[PDB]
Design a protein around this ligand. Structure first.
Ligand SMILES: *[C@@H]1O[C@H](CO)[C@@H](O[C@@H]2O[C@H](CO)[C@@H](O[C@@H]3O[C@H](CO[C@H]4O[C@H](CO[C@H]5O[C@H](CO)[C@@H](O)[C@H](O)[C@@H]5O[C@H]5O[C@H](CO)[C@@H](O)[C@H](O)[C@@H]5O)[C@@H](O)[C@H](O[C@H]5O[C@H](CO)[C@@H](O)[C@H](O)[C@@H]5O[C@H]5O[C@H](CO)[C@@H](O)[C@H](O)[C@@H]5O)[C@@H]4O)[C@@H](O)[C@H](O[C@H]4O[C@H](CO)[C@@H](O)[C@H](O)[C@@H]4O[C@H]4O[C@H](CO)[C@@H](O)[C@H](O)[C@@H]4O[C@H]4O[C@H](CO)[C@@H](O)[C@H](O[C@H]5O[C@H](CO)[C@@H](O)[C@H](O)[C@H]5O)[C@@H]4O)[C@@H]3O)[C@H](O)[C@H]2NC(C)=O)[C@H](O)[C@H]1NC(C)=O
Ligand SMILES: *[C@@H]1O[C@H](CO[C@@H]2O[C@@H](C)[C@@H](O)[C@@H](O)[C@@H]2O)[C@@H](O[C@@H]2O[C@H](CO)[C@@H](O[C@@H]3O[C@H](CO[C@H]4O[C@H](CO)[C@@H](O)[C@H](O)[C@@H]4O)[C@@H](O)[C@H](O[C@H]4O[C@H](CO)[C@@H](O)[C@H](O)[C@@H]4O)[C@@H]3O)[C@H](O)[C@H]2NC(C)=O)[C@H](O[C@@H]2O[C@@H](C)[C@@H](O)[C@@H](O)[C@@H]2O)[C@H]1NC(C)=O
Ligand SMILES: *[C@@H]1O[C@H](CO)[C@@H](O[C@@H]2O[C@H](CO)[C@@H](O)[C@H](O)[C@H]2NC(C)=O)[C@H](O[C@@H]2O[C@@H](C)[C@@H](O)[C@@H](O)[C@@H]2O)[C@H]1NC(C)=O
Ligand SMILES: *[C@@H]1O[C@H](CO[C@@H]2O[C@@H](C)[C@@H](O)[C@@H](O)[C@@H]2O)[C@@H](O[C@@H]2O[C@H](CO)[C@@H](O)[C@H](O)[C@H]2NC(C)=O)[C@H](O)[C@H]1NC(C)=O
Ligand SMILES: *[C@@H]1O[C@H](CO[C@@H]2O[C@@H](C)[C@@H](O)[C@@H](O)[C@@H]2O)[C@@H](O[C@@H]2O[C@H](CO)[C@@H](O)[C@H](O)[C@H]2NC(C)=O)[C@H](O)[C@H]1NC(C)=O
Ligand SMILES: *[C@@H]1O[C@H](CO[C@@H]2O[C@@H](C)[C@@H](O)[C@@H](O)[C@@H]2O)[C@@H](O)[C@H](O[C@@H]2O[C@@H](C)[C@@H](O)[C@@H](O)[C@@H]2O)[C@H]1NC(C)=O
Ligand code: NA
Ligand code: NA
Ligand SMILES: [Zn+2]
Ligand SMILES: [Zn+2]
Lengths: 314, 532, 532, 298
C-alpha cells in the first residue's frame, strides 16, 4: 500500500509507552470531569518520517477513574470506577514525538464515552447503586447536607459548593444518595478582621465525596434519635479537541452495525495531506513542518492489534 | 426468580472472606445469618483457603450483591452502613446463590402492580421483570412474604406506594425482612438439591401415633401418655390451640394418681450430632404441684459400653402452674446419643401432672437469657406499652435491661440498656464490643418454620453523647435513676436499638404471640475477637 | 434402612429390561409402578440402550432383588409368579435403590419384638439387623407403615405372629403393601437428593390466602371467593371435614345473587408441562340448581400470540346437589399453560352456588371410569356388603362390571367381571389380554400423599374352567344371568380378582372413606403389545 | 532335593484341557448329587501324571442326567455350592491313554447370612429332610402324575430344597422319580424289572398366598408347579456353611495322598500285559507353586 503510516502491533513496548504519554496530555487538557485510563490499544499507525517525524495515529480504548482532572494525581493512585458506575469508551488521538530532540506533543484528540447500561447493571446486581442526573434536586440536597457536616467540623474555614460532579442512588432501607462535588473557599471571614490575601475565589480548591441514608432503623434511644445518616470526606488539590459524552448504550436494544464509540479525528480531509507548523519544536526557529493525513480507516488492522485488556470486569 | 444456567451455581460450601472494612456489628450479624442457612438449607460457608471463586463481604456503598456465581474470582458482596440486619445478609446471600427479587418474576404483573409515575426519576431498572427463558420460578406460586420482595414504598417519590399488590390484604405483607419465607427455602433447596441441613436434628409435636420414635423402656411405675387434653390442665396441646383442640396431641405424666418419688421416663430415638453443641427446647405445662420436677439426661453411646453413659444434664424444678413454659437446655454431645425426659412426682398433693409438647433439637447455641411477656395483646398500640425486661447479667458480668416500646400506632421498638451491676467495680469502661442480639420468637411448632425477628447492636467504647460523655460508660457515671420491680433504685444507661423492630401487623402475624405470651431471646457476647 | 456407600447408588434414570419370562400382567403392573416413582420421586426408568449396569426384570423364583447398585452389569430382579402386585414392584425397586427392610434397622428392637421360636426352622437370616456401621436410617424415626416392613406373620410356623410390635395398636399396621409411606419417600428423596419429580405439577387446597397463585382477571359480574362454609352448602371444605370446619377454605361461586348467564372465572398460575398428558382432578359441591355449570378451559401460550389460545376442554353440567363430587379432566398440553375454571349461572332458581376444593394436576393418565360408592361405612363386615358396580365399556368395546365383597370379618375383595355388551357380535373371543386395574382411592388433599390400593388382572384368552369352557369367552356363552339396576336381565361372565384387596382396618385408615364415600378408579387397557 | 513334580502355569493350554477331562471323570464317578464346573485351576504340578487342585462350582444338572457341560448352567448366587477338588490324572500322550486313579472334594454352601444382606427377599435353601419340602415334593409330583395318563412315578428322594416368602410360604424342591411298580390288570407286565433306580428328576414349587385368584366359583388353596426331565477311589465331602465371624484356616481342606512316604510308590497300570508302572508321590503342598498359577476366575 501507499500508506505512509505503517500498521503496528498493540502489545509493542513503544506503542504501549506512547499511548500512556498521549493519555497524560488528554487528561491535562480536560478542565471538567474525571481522568481516563488506558485499558488497551484498539489500533496503532506510525508515520516514520525523517528527523523523527513520528505521527502516531492511535485509536485507544479507555475507562474513567476516581480522580478528578483538577486533582492531577498519578495514574498509579487512580483506581477505576466500580462496575455499577463505570464510564468507558474510545479516544482517537494523534501524537507527535521527536526522539533525538526530546519532544512530545498531542496536536489533536477526540473522545466518545458512554455510561454502562443501567439495565445491565441491575440484571447483574439488583441492589447496586446506579447513577442519577447531576442536576437531581435530591443529589444537590445530599451535596449540601454533607458539605454542612464538613463545615461543622471545620473551625475556621468554610467551603461553598461549586457543582455536582458525580451522583448516584440506591435503597439501603430508604433513600440513599452518593454524590461527589467541587468545593470553593467561601468569602474570607464574612465581614471581620483585616482579611489579607483574599485572592482565593471562583476556583475549586478540592472535591468531596458525601452520602445520605434516610432509613427507619439502628439509632440511639428516644433521648435524641437522628433523622438522616450523613458522611463526608474531602480531598484537596495541591490541544484542539474534546471529550463528548453520549447517553447509555443498549437499554432499549436487547442486543455489530453501529460504531459503539464513533470518533471523528481528521486533521485534513484531503488525501495528499497538510503541514502543521510546529515552530515551538526545540531550539529550531525554522524547519518545523509536520506531515499530516486523514483519519485512518478500518480493515487495515495488524490482526495482532485488538488489544490485550489490562482491566477486565470478570 | 432463579437465574437459568448451571454456571451460576455455587458449590454447597461457599468460601468467604469477612474483609476488615466491615463494622463489628456487621461481622457478628453475618455469622448469625450463616447459621440460619446452616439450620434451614444444605448451603454452608467456609473461610476462603485458596478456592478460585469466593464471596468477599466488605463495607461498601450500602447493601448489594451479584446474582449467582459470576466465576470472576474474588466476587464482592457489600454489607455496608445500615446493612447489619440478619435478613438483609440472608437476602444479599440469596442474590449470590442465584435469585432475583420476587417482583422481578415473569408472572409478577398478575399479582402486583408497578405504579411507575410514583417511582424516583431514573429508578425504573430497580423494577425489572425477567422472561421465563432467563429466570426459572421453579414451579412455586407468587410469594408476597418473600425475603426477596421489595416493600410497597421501594424507590417512592412521595408518600404513595410504588408497588400496589392487586390483593389489598397483602399490600403491607410485601417487604418482610424477618427470615426466609417457606417458598424462599422451597426454591433454594430445589435449586441446590438440598436433602439435609447441618444443624437440624429433631422436631416433635406428637401429632402422630409413632411419637417421633420415642420409646419409654420398662417405665418404672408410670408412663407418659399421648393425650389431647388433661382435665386439670391443659385444655389443648401447644402445637394447635385456638385453631383445633383435639387435633393436637402431647405427652403427659399423671402425678395425681402415683406415690411420692415415682418417676416416668420418655427416651428419644438415636440422634447423631455433627457439631458438638446443641439446643434442646420444649414447652412444659404444670398441672400438679410445684414439688413435681422434670429431670433431663443424655444417654451417650460409646464403643466401650454399648448400653450408654446416662448423665443428668439439667433438672427442672418449681415449674409455674397453669401455663405452657418455654425451656432451653444446653447440650455438648459428640457421640450418637438419646435425650431422656424424666418426670418425677414430688411430695405434694397434685391434681394433674407434667405435660410436654413442641420439642425441638438443633445444633445451635441456646439464648443466654429469655424474656417471657404475658398478657401481650393489650400492650400493642397502647400508650402504656412501655415494657421493661428483668435485669440480666452478660457472660462478662455486664448488667443490662431490655426496653420494648409498643406505644406507636404502627411500629414496635426494642432498646438495649446497660445498668449498674455487682461487677461494675471490676469491668472495663466504656463497654467494649459486646454484641447484644434480641430476637422476637415466632413460636411455631417446627423450628425449621420460624421467621423470628432478630436485631443486634455492638457497644462501641468510643461512642459519645452531646455532653461529651461515653454512651457505654459506667451506668453510675452517665446513667438515669430507674426502679426495679421491688422498688429498689438502680442506674440505667442509655438505650440503643431500633424504633422499627417489627410492625404491629407483623407482630400479630405468624405465632410471635401464642397463648397471649411473647418471648424475647437474648444473647450478649464479646465479639472483640472479630476485627483482626 | 439405607446401605452405606456411594457405590450402591443408581443414576437417577435407571436403565431397565422387561424380559419375555415376565407374565403379561406383571409387565403391565411394573410400568404402573414406574409411574408412582415418576410422580413421587426424582427416580426415573428408561429402557436399556447399552449402559454398563442395568436392572433386568424377569419371572424368577418369586420376587426379589439385590440391595443397591451392585455394579455387576446385568443386575437381575425377579418378578416371578405372585409379584405382579404394584407395591411388590415398588418394594423390590426400593431394595435396588439401596434399602433393606424396616425391621432390619439397628434400633428395630426398641419398636418391634422378634418371636424367634415362632419362625420356620433356618429362616433366621430373613430377620437380620444391620449396625449403623453399614445401615444409615437417615434421621427418620421407626416407621411401622413402611412399604419395606414385613407383616406380623412373615415366616411363621403356625398361627402366631413372628413380629410382635411393642405398641399393640400397630401389630396389624406393619406389612402394608398399598404404596410408599411418607417416611419411605423421605429417605429415598434424601438419599438421591430429590428436589423435583417428573409428573407432579400442582396441588391446591386453598388453605392459604395467596390461593396457590390463582388469579381471577377482571372476573365478569362476579368472582370466586375463598370461604370456609356456605349457608346452603357445604358446611365445611373438602380438605378437612370431621377434623376442623373454619380451619379449611375453598373457592365459591355464589350463583344465588347474580343474573342468568353470569360467569365467574378462576385462572391458575403458569404451568410447564414436561410430558404432554395430564390429569386435572378436583372436588365439586353444588349448592344451587342443576342448571348451573362449570366449564374448563386451557389457556396455552404460543410464541406467535403472547395472550394465549383459550380452548374449552370440558363442560361440566348437571352436577348432583348436596355432596362433594370427584371429577377427572384429561388434558394433552405441550406448551406453558393455565387452567381456567368458569362457573356459570344457568336459568334456574339457585339458593347457593358452585364450591371447588382439593385440586390436583399431575402428568398422569386419568382413570377410564370411576365407581362412586355412597353410604359406605355400613357395608363393611355386613353379610349384605355385596356391591356391584355400574356397567362400563372398555376402550375396545368390552362391557364389564366390578364386584366389591365386604362380607368377611377381616378382608375386602374386588372382582372383575366381563358382561354382555352392544359390541359383543364384533369383539374377539376369548377376551385377549385386557388388563383391568382397580384402585381404591385414598382421598387425601395432596396427590403426592395418597397410598391408594391398586390391583390388576389381565384377561388370558387361554384360561379354561372345570367344564372346559374359556373363562373370558363371550358372556352370553359361559355367563350367569344377572340384573341391572332397572331390572333388565344381562349375562355376567366369571369374576376374577382377589379375596384380600384390602383389610377392613386398612380401608378404615387414611382417607379411602371420606364423607362416607368411596371411589374405585378403573382402567381397562389392551396390553397385547407388551410381549412379541 | 527330589522335586519331580514341576510347578506349571494355570492358564496353560495343556493344564486347562486336562482339568476339563479330570472334572468329567469326577462327575462320572458320582452317583448322588449335582455335577461340578471348572471355575479356575488353583495350582498344578507335573511329573513324568499331574497333581492339580481346582476351584469348582455346582451346576443345575444331576450326576445321573449325564448332560454335557455346555448344557449345564451354574446355580444362582442365593443357592450356590462351591469348593475345591484335589485330583491326580496321568495322561499318556504317545499311547493315547487318559486315567485318574484318585480324587477328593470338599464343598460348602454359600453363607445364608451373606445372601440375605445382599438379597433380603431371595429364596434360601432348607434341610432336604424338611417336612414342608417333602410335602412340596409330593404335592408337585401329584400334579405331574395327574397329567400322566398311563405312567405313574414315585418319589425317590429330595435332592435340593429351598424356601422364601412370596406372600406366604413358598417351597422350591428338586427330587428323583422312579417308575412306580406296574399296577395294571396284566399278570405279566412285560417282565418289567424297572427297580428303585431313578428314571428322572423333577423341579417343583408351592406358593400358599391369600392373593390373585378366580371368583368364589372355585378359589384354589395352593399354587403348584412341576416340570420333569428324564435321564437317557475317592469322594466328595460336603462341609457346612462358612458364616464363622467376619486368612488362616483352609477354606476347603482336602487330603489327597496316595503314599505318605517321600520316595513314592508304583501303581500297576496294566489296563494301558506290558508291565506298566506309574510313579507316585505325597500331596504337593504350598510354597513350591508357580507365580503364574493363581487362576483366572471364570
Ligand atoms: C337398563 O340398564 C341398562 C344398563 O344401564 C341399559 O343398557 C344400555 O342401553 C343403552 C341404550 O338404551 C346402550 O347404549 C348404547 O351403547 C352402545 C355401546 O357403546 C359403547 O360402544 C361404542 C362402540 O365401540 C366400538 O367402536 C368404537 C369406534 O369404532 C371403538 O372406539 C371401540 O373400540 C369399539 O370398537 C369395537 O367394536 C366395533 C364395532 O362396534 C369393531 O369394529 C371394533 O373392531 C371393536 O371391536 C362406543 O363408541 C361407546 O362409547 C361412546 O359413548 C360413550 C357414552 O355413550 C362415551 O363414554 C365414549 O366416550 C364414546 O363416545 C361417543 O359419544 C360421543 C358423544 O357423547 C361421540 O362424539 C363419539 O363419536 C362417540 O360416539 C361405548 O364404548 C353405543 O354404540 C350406542 O350408541 C349408538 O347407538 C345409538 C342408538 O342406536 C345412537 O343413538 C348413537 O348415536 C350410537 O350410534 C353410532 O355409533 C354406533 C356404534 O359406534 C354406530 O354403529 C352407528 O352407526 C352410529 O354411528 C354414527 O354416529 C356416531 C356419533 O354418534 C359417529 O361416531 C359415527 O361415525 C363413525 O362410524 C361410522 C359407522 O357407521 C362410519 O361410517 C364413520 O366413518 C365414522 O366416522 C356415525 O356417524 C348406545 O349409546 C348401552 O350399551 C346399554 N348398556 C349395556 C351395558 O348394554 C338398558 O337400556 C336399560 N333398560 C331398560 C329397559 O331400562
Ligand atoms: C420526583 O417527583 C417530581 C414530580 O414528578 C412529576 O409528578 C409525579 C406525580 C409523576 O407524574 C412524575 O412522573 C412527574 O415527573 C419530579 O419532577 C419532575 O421531573 C420531570 C422530569 O423527570 C419534569 O418534567 C418536565 O416537565 C416539563 C414541563 O413542566 C412545566 O409544566 C408543568 C405543568 O404543566 C410544571 O409542573 C413544571 O414545573 C413546568 O412549569 C416538560 O416540558 C418536559 O418535557 C420534556 O421531556 C419529556 C420527557 O420527560 C419529553 O417527552 C418532552 O417532549 C419534553 O422534551 C418534562 O416532562 C417535571 O416538570 C418535574 N416536576 C416538577 C414539579 O418539578 C422529580 O424529578 C426531579 O426534579 C426535576 C425538577 C428534575 O431536576 C429531574 O431531573 C429530577 O429527577 C422526581 N424525582 C426525584 C428523584 O426527585
Ligand atoms: C479323601 O478325604 C477323606 C476325608 O479327609 C479321607 O478319609 C479320611 O481318612 C482318615 C484317615 O487318613 C480317617 O480318619 C477319616 O475318618 C476319613 N474320612 C472319611 C470321610 O472317609 C480319604 O482317605 C481315603 O479315601 C476314602 C475315599 C476312604 O477310602 C478312606 O477310608 C481312605 O482312608 C481321602 N482320600 C485319599 C486318597 O487320601
Ligand atoms: C394505661 O395505664 C393506666 C391504666 O388505667 C386504667 O386502664 C386503662 C386500660 C383505661 O381504662 C384507664 O381509663 C384506666 O384508668 C392509665 O393511666 C391512668 O390514666 C388516667 C387518665 O387517663 C389517670 O387519671 C389515672 O390516674 C391513670 N392511672 C390509673 C391506674 O388509672 C392509662 O390511661 C392507660 N391507657 C390506655 C389507653 O390503656
Ligand atoms: C342386609 O340387608 C337386609 C336389610 O334388612 C334390614 O336391615 C338390616 C340392617 C337389619 O336390621 C335387618 O333386620 C332388616 O330387616 C337384610 O335382609 C333381611 O333379612 C331378614 C332375615 O334376617 C329377612 O327376613 C328379610 O326379608 C330380609 N330383607 C329385608 C329388606 O328385611 C339382612 O339381614 C341385612 N343384614 C345385616 C346384618 O345388615
Ligand atoms: C412372549 O413371547 C415369547 C415368544 O414369542 C412368540 O413368538 C414371537 C415371534 C411373537 O409371535 C410373540 O407374540 C410370541 O409370543 C414366549 O416365550 C413367551 O411365552 C411364555 O412362555 C413360554 C415358555 C410358554 O409357557 C408360553 O405359553 C408363555 O406365554 C411370551 N410371554 C407371554 C407372557 O405371553
Ligand atoms: Na402437639
Ligand atoms: Na380446602
Ligand atoms: Zn435485593
Ligand atoms: Zn423385601
Amino acid at each position: 500500500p501507499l500508506s505512509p503510516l505503517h500498521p503496528l502491533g498493540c502489545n509493542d513496548s513503544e506503542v504501549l509507552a506512547v499511548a500512556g504519554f498521549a493519555l497524560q496530555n488528554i487528561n491535562r487538557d480536560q478542565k471538567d470531569g474525571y481522568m481516563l485510563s488506558l485499558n488497551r490499544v484498539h489500533d496503532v499507525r506510525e508515520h516514520y518520517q525523517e528527523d523523527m517525524g513520528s505521527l502516531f495515529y492511535l485509536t485507544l480504548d479507555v475507562l474513567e477513574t476516581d480522580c478528578h482532572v483538577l486533582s492531577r494525581k498519578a495514574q498509579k493512585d487512580c483506581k477505576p470506577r466500580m462496575f455499577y458506575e463505570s464510564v468507558y469508551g474510545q479516544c482517537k488521538a494523534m501524537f507527535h514525538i521527536n526522539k533525538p530532540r526530546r519532544v512530545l506533543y498531542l496536536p489533536a484528540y477526540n473522545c466518545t464515552l458512554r455510561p454502562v447500561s443501567k439495565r445491565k447493571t441491575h440484571t447483574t446486581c439488583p441492589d447496586c447503586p446506579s447513577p442519577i442526573d447531576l442536576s437531581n434536586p435530591s443529589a444537590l440536597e445530599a451535596a449540601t447536607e454533607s458539605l454542612a457536616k464538613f463545615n461543622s467540623k471545620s473551625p475556621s474555614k468554610k467551603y461553598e459548593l461549586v457543582k455536582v460532579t458525580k451522583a448516584m442512588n440506591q435503597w439501603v432501607s430508604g433513600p440513599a444518595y452518593y454524590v461527589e462535588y467541587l468545593i470553593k473557599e467561601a468569602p474570607c471571614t464574612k465581614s471581620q478582621a483585616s482579611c489579607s490575601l483574599q485572592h482565593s475565589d471562583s476556583e475549586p480548591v478540592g472535591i468531596c465525596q458525601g452520602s445520605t441514608v434516610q432509613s427507619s432503623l439502628r439509632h440511639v434511644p428516644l433521648i435524641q434519635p437522628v433523622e438522616k445518616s450523613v458522611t463526608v470526606t474531602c480531598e484537596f488539590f495541591e490541544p484542539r479537541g474534546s471529550i463528548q459524552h453520549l447517553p447509555e448504550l443498549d437499554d432499549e436494544k436487547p442486543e455489530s452495525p453501529e460504531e459503539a464509540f464513533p470518533v471523528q479525528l481528521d486533521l485534513t480531509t484531503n488525501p495528499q495531506g497538510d503541514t502543521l507548523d510546529v515552530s515551538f519544536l526545540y531550539l529550531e526557529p525554522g524547519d518545523k513542518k509536520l506531515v499530516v493525513l486523514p483519519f485512518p480507516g478500518k480493515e487495515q488492522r495488524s490482526a495482532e492489534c485488538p488489544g490485550p485488556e489490562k482491566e477486565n470486569n470478570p | 426468580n432463579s437465574i437459568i444456567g448451571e454456571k451460576y451455581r455455587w458449590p454447597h460450601t461457599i468460601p468467604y472472606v469477612l474483609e476488615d472494612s466491615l463494622e463489628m456489628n456487621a461481622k457478628g450479624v453475618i455469622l448469625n445469618a450463616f447459621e440460619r442457612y446452616r439450620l434451614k438449607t444444605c448451603i454452608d460457608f467456609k473461610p476462603w483457603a485458596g478456592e478460585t471463586n469466593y464471596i468477599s463481604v466488605f463495607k461498601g456503598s450500602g447493601c448489594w450483591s451479584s446474582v449467582g456465581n459470576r466465576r470472576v474470582g474474588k466476587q464482592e458482596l457489600s454489607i455496608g452502613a445500615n446493612c447489619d440486619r440478619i435478613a438483609t445478609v440472608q437476602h444479599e446471600f440469596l442474590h449470590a446463590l442465584g435469585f432475583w427479587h420476587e417482583q422481578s418474576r415473569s408472572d409478577r404483573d398478575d399479582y402486583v402492580r408497578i405504579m411507575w409515575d410514583r417511582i424516583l426519576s431514573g429508578r425504573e431498572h430497580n423494577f425489572n421483570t425477567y422472561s421465563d427463558d432467563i429466570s426459572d420460578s421453579l414451579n412455586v406460586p407468587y410469594d408476597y412474604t418473600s425475603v426477596m420482595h421489595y416493600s410497597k414504598t421501594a424507590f417512592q417519590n412521595g408518600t404513595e406506594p410504588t408497588i400496589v399488590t392487586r390483593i389489598s390484604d397483602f399490600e403491607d405483607v410485601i417487604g418482610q425482612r424477618m427470615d426466609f419465607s417457606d417458598s424462599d427455602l422451597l426454591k433454594l433447596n430445589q435449586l441446590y438439591n438440598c436433602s439435609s441441613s447441618l444443624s437440624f436434628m429433631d422436631s416433635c409435636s406428637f401429632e402422630l401415633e409413632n411419637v417421633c420414635g420415642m420409646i419409654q423402656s420398662s417405665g418404672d411405675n408410670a408412663d407418659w401418655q399421648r393425650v389431647s387434653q388433661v382435665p386439670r390442665g391443659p385444655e389443648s396441646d401447644h402445637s394447635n390451640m385456638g385453631q383445633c383442640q383435639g387435633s393436637g396431641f402431647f405427652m403427659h405424666f399423671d402425678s395425681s394418681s402415683v406415690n411420692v418419688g415415682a418417676t416416668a421416663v420418655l427416651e428419644s430415638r438415636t440422634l447423631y450430632p455433627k457439631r458438638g453443641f446443641q439446643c434442646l427446647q420444649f414447652y412444659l405445662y404444670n398441672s400438679g404441684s410445684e414439688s413435681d420436677q422434670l429431670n433431663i439426661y443424655i444417654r451417650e453411646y460409646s464403643a466401650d459400653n454399648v448400653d450408654g453413659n446416662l448423665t443428668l444434664v439439667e433438672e427442672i424444678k418449681e415449674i409455674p402452674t397453669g401455663s405452657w413454659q418455654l425451656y432451653h437446655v444446653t447440650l455438648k454431645v459428640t457421640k450418637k446419643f438419646r435425650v431422656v425426659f424424666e418426670g418425677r412426682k414430688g411430695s405434694g398433693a397434685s391434681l394433674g401432672g407434667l405435660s410436654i409438647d413442641d420439642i425441638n433439637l438443633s445444633e445451635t447455641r441456646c439464648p443466654h437469657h429469655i424474656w417471657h411477656i404475658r398478657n401481650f395483646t393489650q400492650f400493642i398500640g397502647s400508650p402504656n406499652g412501655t415494657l421493661y425486661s428483668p435485669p440480666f447479667y452478660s457472660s462478662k458480668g455486664y448488667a443490662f435491661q431490655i426496653y420494648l416500646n409498643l406505644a406507636h400506632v404502627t411500629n414496635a421498638g426494642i432498646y438495649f440498656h446497660l445498668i449498674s451491676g455487682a461487677n461494675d467495680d471490676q469491668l472495663q469502661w466504656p463497654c467494649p464490643w459486646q454484641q447484644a442480639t434480641m430476637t422476637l420468637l415466632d413460636q411455631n411448632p417446627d423450628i425449621r418454620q420460624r421467621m423470628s425477628n432478630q436485631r443486634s447492636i455492638t457497644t462501641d467504647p468510643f461512642m459519645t453523647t452531646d455532653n461529651g460523655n461515653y454512651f457505654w460508660d459506667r451506668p453510675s457515671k452517665v446513667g438515669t435513676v430507674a426502679l426495679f420491680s421491688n422498688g429498689t433504685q438502680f442506674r440505667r444507661g442509655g438505650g440503643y436499638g431500633t424504633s422499627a423492630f417489627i410492625t404491629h401487623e407483623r407482630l400479630k402475624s405468624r405465632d410471635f404471640i401464642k397463648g397471649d405470651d411473647v418471648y424475647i431471646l437474648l444473647t450478649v457476647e464479646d465479639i472483640s475477637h472479630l476485627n483482626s
